Amino acid sequence: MAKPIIPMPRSRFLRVKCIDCGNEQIVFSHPATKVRCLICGATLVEPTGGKGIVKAKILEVLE
Amino acid sequence: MRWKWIKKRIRRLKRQRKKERG
Amino acid sequence: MARMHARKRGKSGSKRPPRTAPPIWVEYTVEEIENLVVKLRKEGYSTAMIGTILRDQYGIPSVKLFKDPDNPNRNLTITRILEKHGLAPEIPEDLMFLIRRAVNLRKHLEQHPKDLHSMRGLQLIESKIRRLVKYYKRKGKLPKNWRYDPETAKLLVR
Amino acid sequence: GKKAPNGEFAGRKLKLKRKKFRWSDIRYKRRVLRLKEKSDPLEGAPQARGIVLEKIAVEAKQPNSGMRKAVRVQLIKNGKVVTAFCPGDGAIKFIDEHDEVIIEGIGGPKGGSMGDIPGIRYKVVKVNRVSLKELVKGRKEKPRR
Amino acid sequence: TLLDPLANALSHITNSERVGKREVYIKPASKLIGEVLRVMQKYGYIGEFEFIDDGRAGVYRVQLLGRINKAGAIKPRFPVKVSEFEKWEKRFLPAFEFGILIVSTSQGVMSHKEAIEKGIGGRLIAYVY
RNA sequence: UGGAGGUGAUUUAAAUGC
RNA sequence: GAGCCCGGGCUCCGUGAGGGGGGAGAAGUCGUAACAAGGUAACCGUAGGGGAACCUACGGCUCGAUCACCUCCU
RNA sequence: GCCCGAGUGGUGGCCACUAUUAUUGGGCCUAAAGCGGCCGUAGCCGGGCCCGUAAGUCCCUGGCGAAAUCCCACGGCUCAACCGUGGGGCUCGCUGGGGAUACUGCGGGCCUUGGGACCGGGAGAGGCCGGGGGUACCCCCGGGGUAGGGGUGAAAUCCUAUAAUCCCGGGGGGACCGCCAGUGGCGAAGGCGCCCGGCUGGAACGGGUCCGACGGUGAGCGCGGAAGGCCAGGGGAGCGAACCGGAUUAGAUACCCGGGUAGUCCUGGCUGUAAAGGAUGCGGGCUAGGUGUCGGGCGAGCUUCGAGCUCGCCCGGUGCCGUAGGGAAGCCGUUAA
RNA sequence: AGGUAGUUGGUGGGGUAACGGCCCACCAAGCCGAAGAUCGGUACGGGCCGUGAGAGCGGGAGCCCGGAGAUGGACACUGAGACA
């Protein structure tokens, strides 16, 4: 890693735009849990190992 | 060796401890 | 980094964001954040998981950085947001989760007593409680009159 | 940490450690109790007079054989039986039975009889308050009673 | 856990030295070490350092000239009178020339030689030579 | 080129010496 | 309010039949135990048995055996 | 001839040598020596950042630690020893006042690197409980089938003639789970292995999401601990201390062979030992590398579309080889010695 | 490895040159201990002394300083002062 030369996680941010309601959500590239859309009740991502596996096609802007 | 000694020590102990018990 | 406690195994290297002031591409008011927290503590979720869902859904990695400064005595974060409202459990969650689990063990052993290993973690979880108790007394979340026992663990849970 | 506590207030642990571990020196232990002083008669002393009960000769050790001259003397106040090694060639002669014989040690009080002699802890200096090395030389004085 | 974070800095710094790397990284960081490296730099033993304060920790990246032979902390950290200095002078240091028996003092922190010129003393902290 | 196991193992070869 | 005495209990010093072991002496006897796979590998904790060294059982260990047979490793 | 010289030598004691008592200044794989492993009490030891006190701590002053002895000067006795005068030190363990605030203590505040804690994916001989299958050995019954078999270097004792071994069919019992199986995994340790399900311990990783120094270690103390043994109850195929025969042998209380009890299994309890080893206490930090391997993550290619087959970086573990260094050497060497 | 019964403290009192469980009447149940008490051994204590590069270790001799004793053990007078 870089524990003595400043450890920074692997992370990033990405704007996810829902395909069922057009709802714009901020999502941590590593979903630990099931993230639920706040105006669909859908599942955007499912938590597995490392980076949450995104369920099916949902739009993405990478920050 | 230490077989020997352990049983010798034990026999000494018993026999003598027999003589003390008696 | 590690501590192999009741283990020989190096600990996870999970590490914080080295962000010291918060993202502004992420946006929430002191008022909006406070609502989100109160809603989640109303569900039955607990502060670690409250910080978890907020992270995964609303994109706030830790509350302290976003919130404070809004009363710069100290950092404002989940349970310090809760205590000002009165939603805080008087037992620290740390100590609670611990004891919670513990009472479940006992019931297993109750029915099954031929269990080395299961017996041996009873001994391994109590003794973390003991510690966690000991220091709190002196810090003051739990009165000095208390002392820990398995009947005084079955009373706190019920 | 190579053993020891190091820390301001710990010292006491140090202080007891040493002492605890001092008693593995046989010599130190022995003196500090006084086992040197109690066991190997004398009551500790430099020397002791005693009455020559008889004269006895014993054998030499392992690579060796030769008749060492030894007395049996009884220390008088000590009241203990001591067998003893006599210096010199002719000697056993100049010592009459029931003359006074002053006795010493010989070669470390540890117990160590010299390499040849098995038992003998001790030495003789004297016959009727005149010594043996004075009686190996003819001129110096010659014995009585 | 750790204790003596300083020492675990220093000890790296020397074992760092003995290899002959170029620069160092010390993951735990502080005043003690900060200050000590400061005084160390002041005498010159080391080149330049930057610390970056991460929200975790201070880290010091240190530049190694080649000068340092040996530089170590003191174990119980004994108090030392200004009369007893000479004893502790002969023991730890390699000779009269060097004079960074770094102590901590009423005035601040100093080496041995900077302590003696003022005239003030106390408990020992570390050494450098 | 140098190291670790798992199992066949061989009775046709006899006590002592300062 | 001493020394003194008396009856009992407990402890310590001088000294005693008898009894235990040590470091030995190495010319008698029994055996070959270990050290070479010591000629049944050896040790080990435990248990029984044998005159003795010791043997055997069960579990362990290699500070384990010699090729052979099979398996891995720079 | 050498030493020393009115001395020189013997015995005894103490100190030195002896870093053979380790503060200065010792070790503990194999030389003596790690507790079989863990827990936490007493103790010692403690991440960063700010403020108060100034208890330790340093600085200055002041009260004081008799004389003597010691060390230095000068002076006195012919000289010195010895003494006189002047200066210093002295167990030196005490006290009063002022001053500093780095460190340490204490008090208060503040923070997430340590610790703990959570969520989701994941492997395994971890434990317990219930369930269930098959192997082989034995036993018992019917059939078939005769002159042996068993055992050894040779033999005997012993199996078999109301029939053994053997083969076929049927039934009953207790133990255990080859290959799988790995230089493999899990466990604190003793240790742990058919398959399935329930209950349950630990562990890894991604994200530090929460607590905010809560830490380390650990005398005492408490707890777990193979096999053997013991206790009470139940069970008993094979095996098998003791034991009973044969052989061997000069003799054999043996190695080899044929019987055989305790025990080995189950339940409850006790007992607590080992070459309980990696002969290597635990925790943190630092210090070339290489390779194989197990599990988790990641970027790709392949794909049977399952991380199934591979490349590399990373994290945790498990081996081997080896630079610097250490070691007496063997060896150890990012799983440190 | 647990010890302690005037034993720790309280009130009031006696006695003493004088404070004080010193002693005593009443009341209370403390006091001391693993930061090793109690018990057992050994031993006058200090200034110093010996040794050792130092750190340290051993030692209490003349002499000085302070305490204890006078055949063992108890006891008062007389005197400022003695239990001599």
Strands (DSSP E) found in chain D: 48-58, 68-75, 81-85, 100-105, 122-124, 126-127, 130-131
The residue in chain E having the minimum alpha-carbon distance to the alpha carbon of residue A4 is: E27
Question: Do residues C154 and C100 make contact, with C-beta atoms less than 8 angstroms apart?
Answer: no
All residues of chain E having their beta carbon less than 8 Å from the beta carbon of residue A2 are none
Task: Name the nearest CA neighbour of E14 among E24, E4, E5.
Answer: E24
Query: Residues of A near E (CB-CB distance < 8 A)?
Result: 3-7
Structure tokens at A35: 């993230």
Torsion sign over Cα C99, C104, C106, C107: positive
Whether CB of B22 is under 7 Å from strand G: the answer is no
Distance CA C107, CA C114 (A): 13
- Give the gap in angstroms from C-alpha C123 to the nearest C-alpha of chain E: 23
Nearest to C54 by CA among A32, D104, E41, B15: A32
D51: exposed, middle or buried (Cβ count in 10 Å: 0-12, 13-18, 19+) = middle
Say yes or no: Cβ of B9 under 7 A from any atom of strand G.
no
Asked if the Cβ of residue B13 lies within 7 A of any atom of strand G, the reply is no
Within residues 16-55 of protein chain D, the ones with CB less than 7 A from nucleic strand G are none
- Residue for token pair 């404002």: C76
Q: Pick from D117, D128, D124, D114: which is nearest to D87 by CA? A: D124
State phi, psi for C134 to the nearest 5 degrees: -40, -50
Q: How far apart are the CA of D110 and the nearest CA of chain E, in angstroms?
A: 39
Cis peptide before C113 (omega within 30 of 0): no
State the Cα–Cα distance between residues E8 and E62, nearest whole angstrom: 14
Report the candidate in D103, D117, D48, D56 with the shortest Cα–Cα distance to residue D77. D48
Q: E61 contacts in A (CB within 8 Å)?
A: 5
Token output for D8 = 């301001």
Q: D8 CB near a chain E CB, below 8 Å?
A: yes
What is the SS3 assignment for E58? strand
> How does DSSP classify residue D91?
G
| Structure method | cryo-EM
* Interacting residues of A46 by C-beta distance below 8 A, sequence separation 6+: A31, A34, A52, A53, A55
- CB C71 within 8 Å of CB C84: no
d(CA D46, CA D73): 16
Q: Give the full edge-to-edge strand order of the sheet including A59-62.
A: A24-28, A13-17, A59-62
How many structural domains compose chain D? Answer: 1
CA distance to D53, E7, E9, E13, per residue, from A6 (Å):
94, 21, 17, 18
Q: How far is CA C39 from the centre of its chain?
A: 18
* Run of H or E residues at A16: strand A13-17
The answer to whether C142 and C136 have CB atoms below 8 angstroms apart is yes
Q: Are the C-beta atoms of D19 and D32 separated by less than 8 Å?
A: no
**What distance in Å separates residue E93's CA from the closest CA in chain C?**
34
Residue E126, sorted as left (phi over 0), alpha (psi -120 to 50) or beta, turns out to be beta
Query: What residue type is assigned to position D68 of the chain?
Result: R
Could you give the CA distance from residue D75 to residue D84 in angstroms, rounded to a whole number? 12
Among D137, D139, D121, smallest CA distance to D48 is for: D121
The angle subtended at Cα C103 by Cα C102 and Cα C109, nearest 5°, is 95
How many angstroms separate the CA atoms of D136 and D87, rounded? 10
Chain A residue nearest residue E53, CA to CA: A6
Which token pair is C45? 């979720």
Nearest-CA neighbor of C17 among C55, C70, C71? C55
Q: Which residues lie closer than 8 Å to A30 by C-beta, 6 or more apart?
A: A10, A11, A50, A51, A52
Going from the C-alpha of C2 to that of each of A61, C17, E28, the distances in angstroms are 37, 19, 15
Task: Report angle CA C69, C71, C72 to the nearest 5 degrees.
Answer: 60
**Is the Cβ–Cβ distance between C42 and A10 less than 8 Å?**
no
Q: How far apart are the first and last CA of chain E?
A: 28
Neighbouring-strand partners of residue E26: E60
Interior angle at CA A56, CA A54 and CA A59, nearest 5: 75
Instruction: For D98-124, give one letter per residue: b (16+ CB within 10 A) or e.
Output: ebebbbbbbeeeeeebeeebeebbbbb
- Secondary structure letter of residue D93 according to DSSP: G
Q: Give residues 58-87 of chain D lying near strand G (Cβ < 7 A).
A: 61-62, 79
Joined tokens for residue D44: 């500790």
User: What distance in Å separates the CA atoms of residue D75 and residue C103, rounded to the nearest whole number?
Assistant: 81
Count CA atoms closer than 13 A to C46's CA, side-chain side. 8
Closest by alpha carbon to E89, among E51, E116, E57? E116
**C-alpha span between D93 and C111 (Å, rounded):** 96
Query: Resolution in A for the shown PDB structure?
Result: 5.3
Which domain, by its residues, includes D129?
1-145
Whether B20 CB is under 7 Å from strand G: no
Record the tokens describing residue D139, joined without a space.
Answer: 């001129």
Nearest Cα neighbor of C34 from C49, C19, C54 is C54
Is any atom of nucleic acid chain H found less than 7 Å from the CB of residue C49?
A: yes
